[PDB]
Amino acid sequence: ENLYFQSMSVGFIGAGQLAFALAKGFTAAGVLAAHKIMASSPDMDLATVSALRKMGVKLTPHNKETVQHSDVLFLAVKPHIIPFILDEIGADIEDRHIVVSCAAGVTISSIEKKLSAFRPAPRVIRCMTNTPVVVREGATVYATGTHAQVEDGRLMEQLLSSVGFCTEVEEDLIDAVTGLSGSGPAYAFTALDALADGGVKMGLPRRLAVRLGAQALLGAAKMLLHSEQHPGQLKDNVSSPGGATIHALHVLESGGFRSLLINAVEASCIRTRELQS
Amino acid sequence: FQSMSVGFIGAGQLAFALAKGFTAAGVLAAHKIMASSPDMDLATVSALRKMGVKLTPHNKETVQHSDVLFLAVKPHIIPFILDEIGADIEDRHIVVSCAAGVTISSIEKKLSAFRPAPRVIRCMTNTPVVVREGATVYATGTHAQVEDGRLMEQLLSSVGFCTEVEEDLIDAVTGLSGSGPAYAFTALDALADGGVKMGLPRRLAVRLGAQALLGAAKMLLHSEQHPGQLKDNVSSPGGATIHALHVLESGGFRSLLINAVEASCIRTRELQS
Amino acid sequence: GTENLYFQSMSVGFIGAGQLAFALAKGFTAAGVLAAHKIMASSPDMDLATVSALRKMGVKLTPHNKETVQHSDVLFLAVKPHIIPFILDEIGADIEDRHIVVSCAAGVTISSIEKKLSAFRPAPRVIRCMTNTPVVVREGATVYATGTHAQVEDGRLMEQLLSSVGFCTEVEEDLIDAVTGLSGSGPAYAFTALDALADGGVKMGLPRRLAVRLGAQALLGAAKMLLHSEQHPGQLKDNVSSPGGATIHALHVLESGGFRSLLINAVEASCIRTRELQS
Amino acid sequence: QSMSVGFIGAGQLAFALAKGFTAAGVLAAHKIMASSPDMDLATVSALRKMGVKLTPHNKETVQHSDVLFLAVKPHIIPFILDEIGADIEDRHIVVSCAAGVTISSIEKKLSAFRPAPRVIRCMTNTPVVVREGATVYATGTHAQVEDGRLMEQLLSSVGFCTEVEEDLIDAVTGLSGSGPAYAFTALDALADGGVKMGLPRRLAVRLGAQALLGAAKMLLHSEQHPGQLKDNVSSPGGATIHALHVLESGGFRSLLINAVEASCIRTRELQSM
Amino acid sequence: GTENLYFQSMSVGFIGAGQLAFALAKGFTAAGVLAAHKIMASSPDMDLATVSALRKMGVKLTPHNKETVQHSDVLFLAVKPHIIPFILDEIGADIEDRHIVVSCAAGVTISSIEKKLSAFRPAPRVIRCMTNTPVVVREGATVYATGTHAQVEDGRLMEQLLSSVGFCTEVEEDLIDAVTGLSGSGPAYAFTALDALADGGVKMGLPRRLAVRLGAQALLGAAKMLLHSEQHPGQLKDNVSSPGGATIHALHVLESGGFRSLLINAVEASCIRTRELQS
Ligand SMILES: O=C(O)[C@@H]1CCCO1
Ligand SMILES: O=C(O)[C@@H]1CCCO1
Ligand SMILES: O=C(O)[C@@H]1CCCO1
Ligand SMILES: O=C(O)[C@@H]1CCCO1
Ligand SMILES: O=C(O)[C@@H]1CCCO1
Ligand SMILES: [Cl-]
Ligand SMILES: [Cl-]
């Protein structure tokens, strides 16, 4: 409530979906002014880059510049880019820097080793977040590195709590979190496209069908979050005997609806582990 | 509309959720709501009691109390309820049927036997009205004045999304957003089973699953982008997400959700026939 | 129609005179960028129908791969992967400074082409590409990657020549196996789909000719529509699907069969196999 | 020459047709008029932006037009015919675009008002917007040869167009009518496969779209059976025959057959209701 | 080769000049039982490739169905089921005593042909048959049933003529829908199977031409083997399946797919549909 990080300067290495979404969320929350944020990207023609520019974020094609501007430094690049970045700017890492890796599957140990060759005790945090931070409803976990100070973790939680749920986890849960909350929105966007197709099949106009399906999913998740009851208990509550809902639940069960989502989280988590190896 | 009194026939899950939403929105003092049911021992009735809603076993007390009257009963008991308080409808009443499948025409027919020009509105809503995030559609009957629709949309918008639709879409809406939250509750339970299988504590897995679906849905509502395009924005080449999407595709994920909506809508038609 | 290019100092050679050689030779000359007599092709079997078609076009034909190398500036290796090593050993001594060797084989890497040719001569100019037979109607899809000693002008020239018969862009070589899976095998997926759609039209009482014509016109127009649209394919799908209508009923039976999943499996199988065809 | 076109219905079809016609420069955007019962549609906004005259009144559209496209849902058609039937004049050519609705029923409704209505039934698709449509039509009892000739060359300006027997039109609807939607699904999924194997999304969409376009075109210009073209480019042991095999194992062919059949059967249902 | 028959007083007519007419005309003349100029065919579309092929053979062609009736003694109705009623009404008045009307349409019953023709003339001589296009290589499969007024000589003559281009036997009419399901649609099942087997050969590295040749030779020889064997097909299958060997592994994957069941479904679907094509 009126939170604001007076002297924090934030840098994004990578200027894609994730950098844009966090900068949008951070400035939406009012915890940072746009001009105290800087992002660098190898392609300065991404639509995400020009969106950042309209926000008032500082843009540069040199990762060195970003590192020099930043106190908190987000590595918002793909997993295989991380070693190319850590080697490019490892010499520029200074005392003050907190390096926050958002790359899937990439471990704190690997980041700390690459940076420790240039300089001892880099302050490293690993996190998994998602793009819904752009509407301030992200899901974020983080794990603190060996040399992260106690304040570094509390700082980063306070920053990331401003754009959604945020908590600390042991690092060895992050791969699984990537499969649930990290890939989660994509499952929901697939689910929502299909629900709308169902509504359209039954005669709803597409605009209405998309709006209704998204509101229904939004309300159910808010309901569960605010409820002390089991998701199955809530389902039981709204399933009238003989009714329309229980008939529909039966055809979800006949196709193994539940096991598909389990398969999804599994496949994503397993792939995440492979990206590291 | 600050002197408006609301009544409920049927003090079940829907009445509680609407009443909690209405009071949480501040549109309605709890004591200006009255509810009635034949089972006055339910927890829903006890919970409405704590809220400060007025309760009674007499549907007549509810009708004479109320200005806007919600019929929150099961589709097969509507004709009894209509027959029971049909002589007690007054000119001032707006009668809002909530039941699945029951047509405006059938309600206007029974009510007409007692009094010309009954003002009837049909709606399909859902239980997330209880955290003011419901999905609601409504259709106006023959004698519903335009002001009755504005009032209805104003009331129901305070507890979530609300739009007027033609009546012949409501069966389909039922299958989509009426039954929808139960689909999502199933999704979240299974997604949490997935997190647990991969090593997450159950509490953390429920939390992240719910937050992920909440954020995705909200993100789509604030976006000018098609949901497939958001899917595309967040799927890195060769990455974890596109791998998981492939296994969803292989089990026909999309078609099960189409199957669900279809089956709920089709069942909703059989409930009125 | 034509492309307003003309490579007036360019002699082109094809080693291999099968489907790909004839498609490219037909496309180039149809585009007007090359005259057929500046093209020479060679094959081990000179009775192939493709070789006769090349003779009708006026392309130069020879049984000897050395004659093609000596004739040509740009040299297309349009032979199967397992035959590339025998080709490179046969003609590696005849490569000269002017030659740009454009390998069309699936999965054969730049590294291994350069390694085989460098035993005869250092710094070979090598380009790897993946194209498809619709170049024969100037609607190919082509990607390329430049080798270690390819000059800047080499890739710009190859993109000029290949853009005249379809879409063409440069990629990193590590994407070509996956492109092979997608646009390299793409048309075979399409031919399968067009035959099945026509079968469906015939099942519903359409004559075969009409069903084939309409199915092809539908895919052509859909594909062109997406190419020129600013919208996601899902939004264009949505525009066609009238609520409660005929299209959405059909789409549901596609989804019930995991239609999307089969197309993903297909791109994945072709790509994975392409990787095996070098290792 | 002085031809005026009207659309009853201002949905997706009327917009692609109007966009197609003006792209061809067959007639000015302002010589087109569209009427819709909903003027808040994005299609009505889009038509408005390209310069087509809009009206909420079907009678205006009728009195504007010389060729009158009926582009509303099949079940709206008998209502339209009763509304504008007295306003049909001798000059009009009425072109029904609705799925399933037979020439015989349109001629019957309109006959109550004036003898010898000129009716034409057609099925087209949205690729008319890029002048690559697929269009069949049958002429009714009173269409003169000139009416069919004018029809053929108006629709040939925005893609393929041929005259067929009316009893083929339900089947055509399942094939080229719904066809682009099948293609769009195919192209989204192909792109997903490309992205799964490491391709950027934008490039994968582009290559997959280019491959369908090239293959369709090659087939149209070929004297070969598409199975022969398949075999021409399926190298023994190679990547394509491997990929073809996984298509076959899923019954790929049969799904597309089910799709044409499903759409065709639905088209017949639409007229029955 | 030839058949030692010659129907020297027989003029044959085909109403319809499509696949079946040309297959039969080619078979008959190849068998030597008829000269091409004693055959006349008529069609509504005289640009069909089948009509041009008939003109090469030397068959007589006419646009008028009446000219075919007047020319012919044996009159084949080689037209689609829904067109039979229009044919019979068009030429029913021109039927004479000498005519044997041989209907080839799927599902059209003798009763309904006799009923339609008897309005013009009592006691029409009608034969219903179901044959297939392999008559073009003298390996057709044909069954027939004689109508109410067909003479004993009519069926004996039809069996002579049809036995010269393949197998032929008389059946009760109530079996013809099921025969249609089996040998009438049979070859289309075979063409599908031969294309897929060749696909399987190509997957395993065989060139397409060789794979198509070997697949066809395998089915040809298997079918001929069973025709000449006194053994159940299962016993011949057993003879090929070396214990632990390659064939039995393949057979298991066929069984795991319900291969047998698909072929039963196919005969059942064709037969059931054939029954709908009259009702
Ligand atoms: O299950 C039913 O029938 C109703 C409709 C939607 C909510 O509960
Ligand atoms: O798709 C991926 O691999 C990453 C992880 C989760 C979101 O984007
Ligand atoms: O979906 C429908 O019903 C119509 C016909 C084909 C295109 O949109
Ligand atoms: O089938 C193959 O292996 C190659 C891929 C593209 C053309 O032929
Ligand atoms: O079954 C086998 O292994 C052998 C080879 C093919 C025929 O029998
Ligand atoms: Cl190809
Ligand atoms: Cl046959």
Residue numbers in the entry:
A (entry chain C): -6 to 270
B (entry chain D): -2 to 270
C (entry chain A), E (entry chain A): -8 to 270
D (entry chain B): -1 to 271
Paper passage:
The electron density maps for THFA and NFLP were unambiguous and allowed for modeling of the inhibitor at full occupancy in all five chains of the asymmetric unit. The carboxylate of each inhibitor forms two hydrogen bonds with the side chain and backbone of Thr-238, plus a third hydrogen bond with a water molecule bound inside the αK–αL loop (“in-loop water”). For example, THFA and CPC are very weak inhibitors of PYCR1 (Ki > 1 mm). The observation that THFA only negligibly inhibits PYCR1 confirms that the effects of THFA in cells and in vivo are likely because of on-target inhibition of PRODH.
Pyrroline-5-carboxylate reductase 1 (PYCR1) catalyzes the biosynthetic half-reaction of the proline cycle by reducing Δ1-pyrroline-5-carboxylate (P5C) to proline through the oxidation of NAD(P)H. Many cancers alter their proline metabolism by up-regulating the proline cycle and proline biosynthesis, and knockdowns of PYCR1 lead to decreased cell proliferation. The biosynthetic half-reaction is the reduction of P5C to proline catalyzed by NAD(P)H-dependent P5C reductase isoform 1 (PYCR1). Electron density for each analog was present in the previously characterized proline-binding site, which is located in a dimer interface and consists of the αK–αL loop of one protomer and a kinked α-helix of the other protomer. In each case, the carboxylate of the analog binds in the αK–αL loop, while the ring contacts the kink between helices αH and αI of the opposite protomer of the dimer.
